[PDB]
Design a protein around this ligand. Sequence first.
Ligand code: CA
Ligand code: CA
Lengths: 443, 412
Amino acid sequence: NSSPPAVPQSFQVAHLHAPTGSGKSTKVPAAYAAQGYKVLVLNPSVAATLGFGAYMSKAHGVDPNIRTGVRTITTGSPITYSTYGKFLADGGCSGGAYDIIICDECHSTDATSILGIGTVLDQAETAGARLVVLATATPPGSVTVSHPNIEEVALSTTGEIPFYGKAIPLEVIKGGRHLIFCHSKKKCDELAAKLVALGINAVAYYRGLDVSVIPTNGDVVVVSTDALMTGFTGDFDSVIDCNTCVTQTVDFSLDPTFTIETTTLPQDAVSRTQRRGRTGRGKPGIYRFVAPGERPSGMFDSSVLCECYDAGCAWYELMPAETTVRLRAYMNTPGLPVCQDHLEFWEGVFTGLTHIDAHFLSQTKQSGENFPYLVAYQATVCARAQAPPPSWDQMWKCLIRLKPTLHGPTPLLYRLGAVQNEVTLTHPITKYIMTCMSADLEV
Amino acid sequence: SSPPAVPQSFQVAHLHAPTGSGKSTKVPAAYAAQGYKVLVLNPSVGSPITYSTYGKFLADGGCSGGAYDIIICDECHSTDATSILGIGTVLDQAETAGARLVVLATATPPGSVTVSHPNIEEVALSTTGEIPFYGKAIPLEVIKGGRHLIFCHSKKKCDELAAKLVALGINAVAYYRGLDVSVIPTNGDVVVVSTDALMTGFTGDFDSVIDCNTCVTQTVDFSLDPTFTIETTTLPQDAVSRTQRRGRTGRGKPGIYRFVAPGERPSGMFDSSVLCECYDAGCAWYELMPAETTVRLRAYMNTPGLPVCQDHLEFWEGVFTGLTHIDAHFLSQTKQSGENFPYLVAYQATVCARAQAPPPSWDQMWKCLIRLKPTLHGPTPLLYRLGAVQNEVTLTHPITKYIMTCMSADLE
Ligand SMILES: [Ca+2]
Ligand SMILES: [Ca+2]
């Protein structure tokens, strides 16, 4: 639906699939507000959420409420901006206080977005909402299109700088600001250095690497992971894309049980569009690529469901079964990212993870781990057996007191990283998880 | 409309046109009419127009220097090894063998979904019925009476379903990779609970088709036991799968399509194990040096508008180069067993034979080694996992160290 959905006399779920140009998060809510409706606009980033309030004030004479976990600006207004996470943290839909709920950037396959969107899909009507718009410029199945404000040019094997099978010639990047996307930290570094060898000032940016990129529009080539979030990104004469990315994948390896790991795969449509798009911000730019292909958008990994369950327990006080209610509505609602149906399995494993250690859980949460619940739970079983974590990496920090937890074999329940210690596969909970896999996972 | 007319220079066009074009009838006859001798290639198939197959094209060695002006690679969305290798070979040799136009024809382009079907009364499934079909349920008033086809992803899934049905009064016949005619040919009311092993061309004349919307595919795991593992995976079906599953119903009659899940995937990428198959097939079938395979595969990968895959070209070419001194006799045998990776099977058999050791398991994949009198040597030197390993293994054979190294170097 290219136009902003019309609020119906009775509850309904509409899909607004308009380009990033339409003010889906700004012009749209303002429009509904002007009709007298109370709208809630949800986005994945705090950057975004906080940003929409500013714009609105000036650009739309609307001073909205901006709810973020770190800042909750409240000014009794029909338009409320919040991140899916703060939404989920605030109890969900939790009052008959919105006529319209815009789930913006609804194509996001991060745990907090899927859980946040399924929560709306399951509570809006009952909460007194007549419209829930699933907005996105990249619906599932989308392949990147274009806007000739960007000239796309295939890299070739001819060139002084070796690049993912191809080669970047010096004449394209030396002289000007350019952004080169690499799938990993190493590549970012190894590329920057070699770029410097040839007399260019490359800046390798990635996770935990404080923003060291130069704002001044001088000459520079920034080689980085996607960790360079958008928003400020823009003044680059071009971008050179490796056309790949690292993704979290679950592996039902059957070591004791499953493994959360990564795989580097061809990028999908939103990744390319997002990478490509960091040039051509007013002045026409160029996009140079290693591969002419990608994968369409709208498919996420089972590990993300595992994440939704890990979030429900750790941050949202949701019994695995309440989480399955929310995620099931997401999987029952058409026109959204797709993933293999593993709700019974995940719900099944998390329900058996009873009596987690409260302190360990606080620690793993504050520490910003990917799976605070699965981490603190493995720590919990280890401590109760007086056994050591599977490795002494940062992850298992909360068990720091390796002294009593000396007795070797760790009762491994699953693998969230590299396992260094000798393990044992006979813990009741390990065995419980294997039954859940036999019970809900075929082969 | 029409296909891209023959240009002044050689180019690669995209007849991303469906059945409404006649890519296997009218698109060729058009070019033939203009005086052009066309070669049309499909997974399955004088006058200036030859209709063939990709596999037959590889068997013949590819493009003949001066034979066709037009080459249409039909069903260019096909990601089975032979199709990938065949399209890459055309893309690599086309021009130099005198071709002016290469049209990549596909009824379902990238990012394309379920087709507009004006006859199949398609309906969503509701959770109503005591025939729970994949988390939901089926109403036996839909299956009792008339001929039908339910698609499950597994053999054992087909088995159990046909079973719950028979205990409810329905004539259910399970069908998967095995015996046909299990479905009666002219007796109605039958219900076939099939795996995709029942090919589309078969057509059991069905009233409806209920789809589980899932699929099983071959995938490789870089498991690092010794090296890698050829295995499978279940994933949401895609726009191509739905089309072929739902296109099976009626065929002459209107028909109906029932489905569990609302989603799928508009086509997509193909696994790295298919890359392995191409190197395996090149070695085993086409007398192709790994580097020749790499050239043809790179041609495919450099062309826009084709399914994508991970760039493992160097890795695979690297592992097959180290697959030295294979037993010509085991390979002749694995090739005729209709094995999946005849080269890799025949190679693992050679290192066992050489070592006088038994295969990983005694599954019929290893029938070339039935002289297990001396090949009883307890530990089998595991080069990789192609199936279930039931025998004690050793991981010190040089080829194992070689593949591991290739992994380290080529895979991050
Ligand atoms: Ca696996
Ligand atoms: Ca593992």
